């Protein structure tokens, strides 16, 4: 299940006003937590709720709500 995670990203996107670095979306993330967050972001991208920017492979990922 990733919908519960998806909730928290949308909520953490509204609390903040603008960008968020993916690594900062959650203060600290264990490997298991990172995977579910990553899958959550991909699902939010598919539902046209989040804008993503990444310059190269494995560069930092910036998240922005869509409204």
């Amino acid at each position: 299940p990733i919908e519960a995670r998806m909730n928290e990203i949308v909520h953490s996107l509204k609390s903040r006003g603008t960008r968020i670095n993916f690594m900062d979306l959650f203060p600290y993330e264990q490997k298991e937590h990172l995977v579910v967050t990553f899958l959550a972001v991909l699902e939010l991208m598919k539902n046209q709720l989040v804008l993503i920017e990444q310059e190269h492979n494995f560069s930092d990922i910036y998240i922005t709500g869509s409204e």
């Binding site: 490997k31 995977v35 990553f38 899958l39 991208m45 993503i52």
Partner: protein
Amino acid sequence: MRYKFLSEQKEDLTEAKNTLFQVIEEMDEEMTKRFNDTFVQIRSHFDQVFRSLFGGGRAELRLTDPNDLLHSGVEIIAQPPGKKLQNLNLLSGGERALTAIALLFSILKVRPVPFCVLDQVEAALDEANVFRFAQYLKKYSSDTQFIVITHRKGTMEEADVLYGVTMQESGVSKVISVKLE
């Protein structure tokens, strides 16, 4: 009326038959020997690979007809830990999938490849077996580069990096990436 060109065509047929029968015979000899030699090598790995993936149990490969090495089937008999030893036909859906993966990974020990693309091969595993499948990949990724298409979270947890493919705009795949290691 007899024709020379027809007589020659018949002689040529007979001549070609003599050589082509020898080709066919040698092909049968190559297939029988290579099938059996390879079967012996795969069998030599199968129980160990099975046990690594299931966390116990035991398993065996057996030729259905050892005296017909051109056509014999292969029987697979396996005992998932906590269960009875049975023909693969009678095991659960998840046990069957993992046993097939154990055979494929035993084949990889006999016929190694530098890279291996696994496209959702573990879709049918019981959730409780995914971690040992994922640990197997990590362990043997020193000798085989693994590119793993997967929708099982336990497999992702053992990857070195993740590529995420998703359609932000309809029909158009976007790709992002993150290192776990």
